[PDB]
Enzyme design. Structure first.
Site, PDB file in Angstrom:
ATOM      1  N   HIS A 239      -4.359  68.050 -26.054  1.00  0.00           N
ATOM      2  CA  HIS A 239      -5.410  67.961 -25.020  1.00  0.00           C
ATOM      3  C   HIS A 239      -6.500  66.979 -25.407  1.00  0.00           C
ATOM      4  CE1 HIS A 239      -7.919  69.851 -21.735  1.00  0.00           C
ATOM      5  NE2 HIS A 239      -8.829  69.315 -22.495  1.00  0.00           N
ATOM      6  N   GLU A 240      -7.122  67.179 -26.588  1.00  0.00           N
ATOM      7  CA  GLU A 240      -8.187  66.196 -26.967  1.00  0.00           C
ATOM      8  C   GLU A 240      -7.686  64.777 -27.070  1.00  0.00           C
ATOM      9  OE1 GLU A 240     -10.790  67.696 -26.207  1.00  0.00           O
ATOM     10  OE2 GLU A 240     -10.097  69.728 -26.694  1.00  0.00           O
TER      11      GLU A 240
ATOM     12  N   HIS B 168      -7.252  63.152 -23.606  1.00  0.00           N
ATOM     13  CA  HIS B 168      -8.511  62.697 -23.068  1.00  0.00           C
ATOM     14  C   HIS B 168      -8.832  61.246 -23.448  1.00  0.00           C
ATOM     15  CE1 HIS B 168     -10.529  65.989 -20.974  1.00  0.00           C
ATOM     16  NE2 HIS B 168     -10.559  66.771 -22.044  1.00  0.00           N
TER      17      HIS B 168
ATOM     18  N   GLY C  51     -12.998  75.370 -27.458  1.00  0.00           N
ATOM     19  CA  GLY C  51     -11.842  75.086 -28.280  1.00  0.00           C
ATOM     20  C   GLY C  51     -11.925  73.813 -29.102  1.00  0.00           C
ATOM     21  N   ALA C  52     -12.286  72.705 -28.426  1.00  0.00           N
ATOM     22  CA  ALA C  52     -12.433  71.441 -29.106  1.00  0.00           C
ATOM     23  C   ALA C  52     -13.023  70.441 -28.122  1.00  0.00           C
ATOM     24  CB  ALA C  52     -11.096  70.896 -29.639  1.00  0.00           C
TER      25      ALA C  52
ATOM     26  N   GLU D 265     -13.388  66.015 -27.204  1.00  0.00           N
ATOM     27  CA  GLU D 265     -12.718  64.732 -27.296  1.00  0.00           C
ATOM     28  C   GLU D 265     -13.623  63.543 -27.665  1.00  0.00           C
ATOM     29  OE1 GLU D 265     -13.332  66.511 -24.356  1.00  0.00           O
ATOM     30  OE2 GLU D 265     -13.734  65.101 -22.722  1.00  0.00           O
TER      31      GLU D 265
ATOM     32  N   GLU E  76     -21.173  67.332 -24.909  1.00  0.00           N
ATOM     33  CA  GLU E  76     -20.736  67.661 -23.525  1.00  0.00           C
ATOM     34  C   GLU E  76     -21.227  69.084 -23.182  1.00  0.00           C
ATOM     35  OE1 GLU E  76     -16.652  67.186 -22.580  1.00  0.00           O
ATOM     36  OE2 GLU E  76     -16.985  67.627 -20.472  1.00  0.00           O
TER      37      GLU E  76
ATOM     38  N   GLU F 224     -10.507  67.099 -16.613  1.00  0.00           N
ATOM     39  CA  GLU F 224      -9.951  68.370 -17.186  1.00  0.00           C
ATOM     40  C   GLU F 224      -8.642  68.794 -16.543  1.00  0.00           C
ATOM     41  OE1 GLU F 224     -10.829  69.105 -20.005  1.00  0.00           O
ATOM     42  OE2 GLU F 224     -12.824  68.325 -20.173  1.00  0.00           O
TER      43      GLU F 224
HETATM   44  C1  LIG Z   1      -9.366  72.705 -25.616  1.00  0.00           C
HETATM   45  C2  LIG Z   1      -9.089  72.385 -24.190  1.00  0.00           C
HETATM   46  C3  LIG Z   1     -10.144  73.110 -23.414  1.00  0.00           C
HETATM   47  C4  LIG Z   1     -11.453  72.489 -23.853  1.00  0.00           C
HETATM   48  N1  LIG Z   1     -12.470  73.212 -23.103  1.00  0.00           N
HETATM   49  C5  LIG Z   1     -12.787  74.444 -23.644  1.00  0.00           C
HETATM   50  O1  LIG Z   1     -12.346  74.785 -24.745  1.00  0.00           O
HETATM   51  N2  LIG Z   1     -13.713  75.236 -22.982  1.00  0.00           N
HETATM   52  C6  LIG Z   1     -14.472  74.941 -21.749  1.00  0.00           C
HETATM   53  C7  LIG Z   1     -15.844  74.318 -21.894  1.00  0.00           C
HETATM   54  C8  LIG Z   1     -16.975  75.026 -21.489  1.00  0.00           C
HETATM   55  C9  LIG Z   1     -18.240  74.456 -21.536  1.00  0.00           C
HETATM   56  C10 LIG Z   1     -19.529  75.024 -21.072  1.00  0.00           C
HETATM   57  C11 LIG Z   1     -18.466  73.229 -22.001  1.00  0.00           C
HETATM   58  C12 LIG Z   1     -19.916  72.767 -21.922  1.00  0.00           C
HETATM   59  C13 LIG Z   1     -17.362  72.505 -22.396  1.00  0.00           C
HETATM   60  C14 LIG Z   1     -16.083  73.054 -22.347  1.00  0.00           C
HETATM   61  C15 LIG Z   1     -11.499  71.024 -23.438  1.00  0.00           C
HETATM   62  O2  LIG Z   1     -11.581  70.737 -22.259  1.00  0.00           O
HETATM   63  N3  LIG Z   1     -11.483  70.131 -24.481  1.00  0.00           N
HETATM   64  O3  LIG Z   1     -11.544  68.743 -24.202  1.00  0.00           O
HETATM   65  C16 LIG Z   1      -7.717  72.983 -24.073  1.00  0.00           C
HETATM   66 ZN   LIG Z   2     -10.804  68.844 -21.977  1.00  0.00          ZN
END
Ligand SMILES: *[C](*)C(*)(*)(*)([C][C]([N]C(=O)[N][C]C1=[C]C([C])=C([C])[C]=[C]1)C(=O)[N][O])[C](*)*
Ligand SMILES: [Zn+2]
Ligand SMILES: [Mg+2]
Ligand SMILES: [Mg+2]
Ligand SMILES: [Mg+2]
EC number: 3.4.11.-
Length: 890
Positions: free
Chosen positions: A301-302, A305, A265-266, A268, A124, A324
């Site tokens: 969160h993951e 999703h 962070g992570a 899905e 992603e 999101e």
């Molecule tokens: C862990 C969730 C937040 C996580 N998104 C995240 O950690 N950062 C944002 C992000 C930025 C970019 C550029 C890409 C390409 C992806 C994500 C998340 O949405 N996990 O499903 C709390």
């Molecule tokens: Zn997410």
């Protein structure tokens, strides 16, 4: 530049039904063979077949076993593979490619890469095209059959999405594993992992269908002891989605994997969620308290999703907030349920009103559904996430639990196994709304403006009470400032959760009610109001707005003391602080600009201080809540209220306020610091990684808050308490000892002590780095150089780089040094980092987002560094887009 526009969405001329991959990992190359079973859609007009494919080395290309040749049947420019239309079949066909990639040199951490000794993917948003050719957009859904091969001694565990259907030996010390993922998916949810990984496992039986699910959590061997809380958090997540939403997991197995090098962070990926180790691994002897909440939120969160993103996916990337925002909302409902502490919701509010409000008043301001982009990666923003989550939450507020659940089930079922848009969600919620209103002519068309309109609404109030009639009115007005996205702003559907407090006795005077403001202004009237109330407005922070309560400080104090709603109580306090901050800021600014030899400062309200003391001394009041009341509002909140901000004047303002309050309350603070010790630092559950007492953690937070206040104050003999605190077995405590020791000659002894306690755990050492970086040291620039030379060195680990630099950027006095040396230091780190990890470089730009809010000398300095960064040769598209938008050029 190439700009993509929301309005221009069109379905592809092609369909990809099956993907069959063979990924063969070797030391100095990975070979990727891929068969795409494709077809022509009903939209096809005989166009060229164009695949995304970035940085791939082609070994071979064929269609229906006919080799295609460069210059004759195809072109490739290192970004796009074009198959000329004469050679694109007119019905079902097989496209075969074989390419070579190099995860061992992929320091961008997008696509397939090496993280220590693990091979991992991140696809992603646009990473799958760095692995193999595809039509890399989320409406191209397909089923995947994936074979991974590698050296068995180096890579004994091989994982991809879905069921493991075979495992086999291969000559020369290699082995393979084959995976079948039966669920149709977009390519951004593909994942593979290969490594020497260890695991913990458990079996979970689903609530309704009694399906056995095998749950595996994986890490490198050194840290397998740190996996148990994650596993517990997964079990909690699965039960919450069953219990609240009626949603069961849909595969026989779910793997979670921690990797050390991760940009965010992570992620899905279906059946194979991959995490930054900082968001999956903890142990109570080697992690700070905040790790526990972070792991709970990120695992949740993951997991969430799996429906909101995976089983219902995105039509296009403009819809990002649909997965999101909605998943963050689900995550927040879950965390609020699991922690049962009011500080959970407050923390979310604090984050929005500081970072997201700043973004929304910046030149980067965008609606939660953007209209255009160059790099989609730059729209993974606190607007899309956190304002999106508040927009998803307002549906719950408006509908109530029962009708919300009905709308959500309409959405999840209708769109199962398919793509969706923000309109689809709004439609499902609108069907629930019609039912709730028992009116099939009710609509949520106005609601859509929350997706399309940027900026933060301002909601203001006037009140009138008629004592003879026992009748009260609340007159409400909304305004959104015009911006680059809309020159004329329309009124939004704003839900205002409200109570009315009797100021005589502190009691509730009405059933809580939700006012539905739909016009630019409206007046809401209440009968049988026996005395003049104080209104309790936007309970739970019921919409993402700027609130102008038009209350006196005396009325705010009464709500702080007596209202039921934690947010209103907290906001009332916030408001008292802001009135004082802006007044003292103006007094200091006038003195500085006029070069006065003497002047006055408005003192902090003495009745507010008394109210703080009353709350702190209440043994039945909440510890976490107390820690919010003795803390001034964050600088990034304050800056939304000041134009041409002089950061040094602000720092003097905050110092004056803190000192005024501490001159009254420090003995109270010390008494509480000591009296809370026994319960705060009780070792119940210290050996239990399946259970966290969040209330106890908030007691440690309050102790650590009070110790910082007393240390900055130089409260007599507080160094004794600091030294004792450094011997606590809780890392939150011993790392606090280092921070608070900044104000004493003992800081470098504590620096050494805590370094030794931290250096043998990768993630604890990163928390030590953050502690040093945020330390309130006059010599912070020399300390940063020491961190660079002795600890960070040449690391390309995003967690190391973020740990060293980001906390320091929040040092209001030192980062904003009027020489510009702070701005120059961070800009050089951004530019350095952009040469190998553009996403992380853009993260590191965060401090510059407020540039146009500063005084004109600091504006000039920041702007100079931003334009220097923009001059860098071979600047990434990610960074260049970011900085052009930020500096009003795009
Ligand atoms: C862990 C969730 C937040 C996580 N998104 C995240 O950690 N950062 C944002 C992000 C930025 C970019 C550029 C890409 C390409 C992806 C994500 C998340 O949405 N996990 O499903 C709390
Ligand atoms: Zn997410
Ligand atoms: Mg390459
Ligand atoms: Mg979160
Ligand atoms: Mg390392």
């Amino acid at each position: 530049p190439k700009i993509h526009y929301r309005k221009d969405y069109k379905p592809s001329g092609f369909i990809i039904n099956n993907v069959t991959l063979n990924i063969n990992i070797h030391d100095n190359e990975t070979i990727v063979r891929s068969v795409l079973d494709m077809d022509i859609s009903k939209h096809n007009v005989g166009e060229d077949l164009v695949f995304d494919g970035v940085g791939l080395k082609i070994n071979e290309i064929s269609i229906n076993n006919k080799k295609l040749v460069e210059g004759e049947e195809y072109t490739y420019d290192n970004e796009f593979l074009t198959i000329f239309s004469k050679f694109v079949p007119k019905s079902k066909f097989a496209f075969s490619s074989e390419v070579i990639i190099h995860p061992e040199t992929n320091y961008a951490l997008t696509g397939l890469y090496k993280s220590k000794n693990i091979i991992v993917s991140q696809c992603e948003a646009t990473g799958f095209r760095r692995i193999t050719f595809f039509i890399d957009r989320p409406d191209m859904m397909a089923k995947y059959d994936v074979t991974v091969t590698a050296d068995k001694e180096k890579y004994p565990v091989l994982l991809s999405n879905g069921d493991k259907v075979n495992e086999f030996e291969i000559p020369g010390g290699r082995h393979g594993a084959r995976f079948n993922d039966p669920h149709l998916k977009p390519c951004y949810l593909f994942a593979v992992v290969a490594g020497d990984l260890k695991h913990l496992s458990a079996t979970y039986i689903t609530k309704y269908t009694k399906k056995k699910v095998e749950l595996y959590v994986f890490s490198e061997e050194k840290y397998v002891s740190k996996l148990q809380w994650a596993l517990e958090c997964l079990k909690k997540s699965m039960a919450f989605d069953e219990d609240y939403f009626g949603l069961e997991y849909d595969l026989s197995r779910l793997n979670l994997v921690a990797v050390s090098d991760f940009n965010v962070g992570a992620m899905e990926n279906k059946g194979l969620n991959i995490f930054n180790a900082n968001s999956l691994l903890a142990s109570k002897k080697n992690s700070i308290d905040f790790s526990y909440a972070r792991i709970l939120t990120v695992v949740g969160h993951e997991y969430f999703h799996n429906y909101t993103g995976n089983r219902v996916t995105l039509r296009d990337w403009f819809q990002l907030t649909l997965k999101e925002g909605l998943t963050v909302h689900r995550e927040n409902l879950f965390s609020e349920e699991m922690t049962k502490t009011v500080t959970t919701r407050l923390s979310h509010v604090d984050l929005l009103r500081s970072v997201q409000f700043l973004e929304d008043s910046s030149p980067l301001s965008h609606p939660i559904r953007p209209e255009s982009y160059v790099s989609m990666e730059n729209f993974y923003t606190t607007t899309v996430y956190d304002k999106g989550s508040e927009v998803m939450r307002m549906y719950l507020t408006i509908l109530g639990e029962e009708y919300y659940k009905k709308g959500f089930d309409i959405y999840i079922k209708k769109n199962d196994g398919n793509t969706a848009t923000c309109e689809d969600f709004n439609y499902a919620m609108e069907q629930a709304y019609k039912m709730k209103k028992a009116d099939n002519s009710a609509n949520l068309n106005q609601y859509l403006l929350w997706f399309s309109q940027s900026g933060t609404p301002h909601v203001s109030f006037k009140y009138n009470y008629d004592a003879e009639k026992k009748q009260y009115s609340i007159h409400v007005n909304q305004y959104t400032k015009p911006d680059e996205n809309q020159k004329e702003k329309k009124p939004l559907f704003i839900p205002i959760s409200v109570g009315l407090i009797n100021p005589e006795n502190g009691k509730e005077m009405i059933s809580q009610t939700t006012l539905e403001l739909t016009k630019e202004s409206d007046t809401f009237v209440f009968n049988n109001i026996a005395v003049k109330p104080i209104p309790s407005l936007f309970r739970g922070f019921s919409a993402p707005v700027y609130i102008e309560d038009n209350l006196t400080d005396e009325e705010r104090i009464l709500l702080l003391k007596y209202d039921s709603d934690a947010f209103v109580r907290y906001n009332s306090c916030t408001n008292i602080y802001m009135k004082q901050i802006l007044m003292n800021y103006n007094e200091f600014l006038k003195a500085k600009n006029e070069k006065l030899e003497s002047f006055n400062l408005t003192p902090v309200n003495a009745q507010f201080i008394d109210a703080i003391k009353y709350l702190l001394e209440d043994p039945h009041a909440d510890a976490g809540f107390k820690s919010y009341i003795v803390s001034l509002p964050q600088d990034r909140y304050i800056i939304n209220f000041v134009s041409n901000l002089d950061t040094d004047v602000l720092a003097d303002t905050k110092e004056y306020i803190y000192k005024q309050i501490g001159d009254k309350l420090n003995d109270v603070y010390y008494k509480m610091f000591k009296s809370l010790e026994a319960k705060a630092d009780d070792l119940t559950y210290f050996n239990d990684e399946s259970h966290v007492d969040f209330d106890q953690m908030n007691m440690r937070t309050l102790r650590n808050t009070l110790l910082s206040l007393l240390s900055k104050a130089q409260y007599p003999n507080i160094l004794n308490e600091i030294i004792e605190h450094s011997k606590s077995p809780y890392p939150s405590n011993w790392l606090t000892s280092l921070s608070v020791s900044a104000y004493f000659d003992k800081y470098f002894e504590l620096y050494d002590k805590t370094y030794k306690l931290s250096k043998d755990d990768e993630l604890l050492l990163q928390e030590w780095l953050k502690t040093v970086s945020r330390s309130d040291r006059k010599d912070i620039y020399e300390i940063l150089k020491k961190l660079e030379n002795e600890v960070l060195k040449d690391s390309k680990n995003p967690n190391d780089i973020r740990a060293v630099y980001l906390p320091f950027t929040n040092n209001l006095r030192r980062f904003h040094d009027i020489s510009g040396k702070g701005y120059k230091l961070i800009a050089e780190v951004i530019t350095k980092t952009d040469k190998f990890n553009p996403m992380v470089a853009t993260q590191l730009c965060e401090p510059f987002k407020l540039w146009n809010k500063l005084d004109t000398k600091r504006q000039e300095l920041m702007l100079n560094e931003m334009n220097t960064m923009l001059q860098e040769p071979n600047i990434s598209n990610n960074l260049k887009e970011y900085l052009l938008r930020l500096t009003n050029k795009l």
